[PDB]
Scaffold this active site. Structure first.
Site, PDB file in Angstrom:
ATOM      1  CG  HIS B  67      -0.060   0.224   2.151  1.00 24.21           C
ATOM      2  ND1 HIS B  67       0.518   1.135   2.923  1.00 24.21           N
ATOM      3  CD2 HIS B  67       0.328  -0.695   3.330  1.00 24.21           C
ATOM      4  CE1 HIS B  67       0.645   0.633   4.088  1.00 24.21           C
ATOM      5  NE2 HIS B  67       0.567  -0.555   4.567  1.00 24.21           N
ATOM      6  CG  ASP B  69      -2.614   3.689   2.720  1.00 26.09           C
ATOM      7  OD1 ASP B  69      -2.089   2.412   2.210  1.00 26.09           O
ATOM      8  OD2 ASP B  69      -3.946   3.380   3.752  1.00 26.09           O
ATOM      9  CG  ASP B 100       2.725  -0.029   7.696  1.00 27.62           C
ATOM     10  OD1 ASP B 100       2.692  -0.318   6.484  1.00 27.62           O
ATOM     11  OD2 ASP B 100       2.668  -0.121   9.220  1.00 27.62           O
ATOM     12  CD  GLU B 134      -2.572  -2.175   5.107  1.00 25.35           C
ATOM     13  OE1 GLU B 134      -3.231  -3.136   5.737  1.00 25.35           O
ATOM     14  OE2 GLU B 134      -2.704  -0.500   5.568  1.00 25.35           O
ATOM     15  CD  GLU B 135      -1.435   1.693   7.339  1.00 20.17           C
ATOM     16  OE1 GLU B 135      -2.056   0.992   8.047  1.00 20.17           O
ATOM     17  OE2 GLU B 135       0.037   1.596   7.532  1.00 20.17           O
ATOM     18  CD  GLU B 163       1.917  -4.146   5.941  1.00 23.49           C
ATOM     19  OE1 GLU B 163       0.705  -3.920   4.898  1.00 23.49           O
ATOM     20  OE2 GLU B 163       2.573  -3.280   5.860  1.00 23.49           O
ATOM     21  CG  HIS B 349       0.613   2.107  13.002  1.00 20.03           C
ATOM     22  ND1 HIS B 349      -0.228   2.072  12.907  1.00 20.03           N
ATOM     23  CD2 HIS B 349       0.677   1.475  11.349  1.00 20.03           C
ATOM     24  CE1 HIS B 349      -0.667   1.320  11.741  1.00 20.03           C
ATOM     25  NE2 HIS B 349       0.065   1.314  11.207  1.00 20.03           N
TER      26      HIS B 349
END
Ligand SMILES: [Zn+2]
Ligand SMILES: [Zn+2]
Ligand SMILES: [Zn+2]
Ligand SMILES: [Zn+2]
Lengths: 375, 377
Positions: B67, B69, B100, B134-135, B163, B349
């Site tokens: 992803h 995003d 990520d 995806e998030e 990932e 994150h």
């Protein structure tokens, strides 16, 4: 009803703390015609009004605030909170009970008293603020500082807060519990929800603590004050992401405490309970008000007879409910008595007051002026 | 002289691609794969951008999934450097998505370019399935691409999701499955009023405290030999607008379950309601099943990853289903073998997200050798 017409004029002004939004000007223009000296007192972002008729004692003072608490979910109201209207004998609107209807009754009562008794004794005064609901650091407390520095003393002060429980004037308050605010900031570590061992979730660590605080017994009060009560008003954590652990939890709580404890004893038992749950945090304490109790004198006696004459109800003294600007007036030596409409809906959505109590309250306030300044 | 993987990583990291804005990331990738024979098929669903890049028309089909995003930054006062201004400090690449998962996207592209240079006559096909959501809710991302591929009978044999799968060192962990993800927005209804007149109101924070306390220390299951135990987490909690003397009318609690195959979403929803009803709470919950648990078979993809990782780092990789989930949950139902391999997940994150630069070239070499072990030899 002159009280209903003036109430609507004030209720239409959105006055969320600390915005006055012309309420003190509407009142001043009315009092300025019945011999009151208008003295606006702006302190920072707060507007205050000191209006006075007469130069000799005894000095009777009507106290109150023009600010109201936030409305809340606007779609939860059956009518615009700042668009007052009457539905089945009930005036709905923010400030309809706390306390724009009392501000109006105090103004009408005063106009009617000056009309029937123009050569009354002593003086009548109005001490109005636009911040009684919030921090209250630039409201009545600064007006009093000004009066005290120029030796201007108040003998009797009737605060128009809604003191009633079931029927008009069934309760009058000569004292109040203290108010201790707090802003708890529990520290955690922002991370991924599926990797909690690599982060610290503050909501999780704090839950058992906030749960214990909510069931904690602080004191059992005494014969003059009800028991101390703890209430969480706000709680915030997260930015909206469903897969992100928040880095910080903000909990805002308050204590309405009796004389059985001090602000310092509550501060100490709270830190003890938080440390007991091994939390890492910062707290910004704020003593909003001390417990106070004024002596029972002629003001209470004038109110017992005025209330009994208008409603037929035998009033009862109490220090229940929240607090008022009476906490900033009591230290001057003035007797303090709070008399108002029902407090059943104050700070609630769809706040309202029974219209049948507006004229009687005005009558009660006018009779208290007669019992203390006529003779 | 920056490596090709670092070079492309910086170009992608300079794009503020908060979900679901792609911010040209799929165009940067496509412009490069298009030069090495990849057909470019962008698929936009709602406000989400997706890319299906495919080189070859025959099976087997190897697919790189990922992803563009990234999760929101929050505020630059907590970041030592601008999160969308990729920077290197003591061999560590800092910036949102550095782990990520933009560095893996770059590695996947450079690996593909080098593999096509050495093995132009490779067998089967190579494909990239990239999404810009995806998030977040992920209802218009990889799930729609798969719906499109499935309706036209276009099957993926092997799918490597980039990932960040590593714990302490590159490739020490690879994932062929994941727990499910169950989201909820709990709205505890109280009654707004004055804090000094609590009996005339109903404080939702006070009523929910004991209930929230029980959920946080509740044991949902013990997991099993394939999945870790189900974990519960509160992401957001909100009540009040700031007034200190006003009891709030409602409490909003956002929480999530990463659950094992020992329980079902309906079983969790049934326990939560029992616990809340037990505490006599008046409320409403909006559930959202973000992902079902999935476990794909151990096949050639795993064998190729074990070999490559061992050859590049001297590490014997270990299978797992730990962590959160990925778009592998939308790909696994097609029958494709799924294996997640990437950089360390220690800072995803988090504020000051970063990745060790020494792992960027080895990761690229790993992906390149996975292509060799599956489409060349
Ligand atoms: Zn009030
Ligand atoms: Zn109030
Ligand atoms: Zn990711
Ligand atoms: Zn992520």
């Amino acid at each position: 009803s002159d009280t209903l017409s003036l109430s609507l004029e004030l209720l239409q002004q959105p006055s969320v703390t600390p915005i006055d939004h012309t309420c003190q000007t509407i009142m001043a223009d009315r009092l300025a015609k019945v011999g009151f000296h208008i003295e606006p007192m702006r302190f920072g972002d707060v507007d205050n009004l000191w209006a006075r008729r007469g130069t000799e004692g005894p000095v009777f003072c009507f106290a109150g605030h023009t600010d109201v608490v936030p409305t809340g979910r606007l779609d939860a109201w059956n009518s615009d909170p700042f668009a007052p209207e009457i539905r089945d004998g009930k005036l709905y609107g923010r400030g309809s009970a706390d306390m724009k209807t009392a501000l109006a009754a105090m103004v009408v009562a005063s106009e009617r008293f000056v009309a029937k008794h123009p050569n009354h004794k002593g003086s009548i005064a109005f001490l109005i603020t636009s911040d009684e609901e919030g921090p209250a650091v630039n409201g009545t407390v600064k007006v009093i500082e000004t009066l005290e520095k120029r030796n201007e003393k108040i003998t009797w002060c009737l605060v128009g807060e809604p003191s009633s429980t079931h029927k008009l004037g069934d309760i009058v308050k000569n004292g109040r519990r203290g108010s201790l605010n707090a802003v708890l900031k529990v520290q955690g570590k922002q991370g991924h929800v599926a990797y909690p061992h690599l982060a610290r979730n503050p909501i999780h660590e704090a839950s058992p603590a906030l749960a214990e605080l909510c069931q904690t017994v602080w004191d059992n009060g005494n014969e003059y004050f009800p028991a101390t009560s703890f209430q969480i008003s706000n709680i915030h954590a997260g930015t909206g992401a469903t897969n992100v652990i928040p880095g910080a939890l903000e909990v805002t709580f308050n204590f309405r405490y009796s004389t059985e404890v001090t602000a310092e004893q509550l501060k100490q038992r709270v830190h003890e309970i938080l440390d007991k749950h091994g939390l890492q945090y910062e707290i910004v304490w704020n003593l909003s008000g001390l417990p106070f109790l004024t002596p029972v004198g002629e003001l209470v006696n004038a109110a017992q007879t005025a209330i009994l004459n208008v409603t037929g109800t035998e009033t009862e003294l109490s220090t229940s409910g929240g607090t008022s600007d009476g906490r900033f007036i009591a230290p001057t030596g003035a007797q303090v008595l709070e008399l108002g409409v029902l407090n059943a809906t104050i700070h609630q959505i769809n706040e309202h007051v029974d219209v049948h109590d507006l004229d009687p309250l005005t009558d009660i306030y006018e009779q208290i002026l007669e019992n203390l300044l006529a003779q």
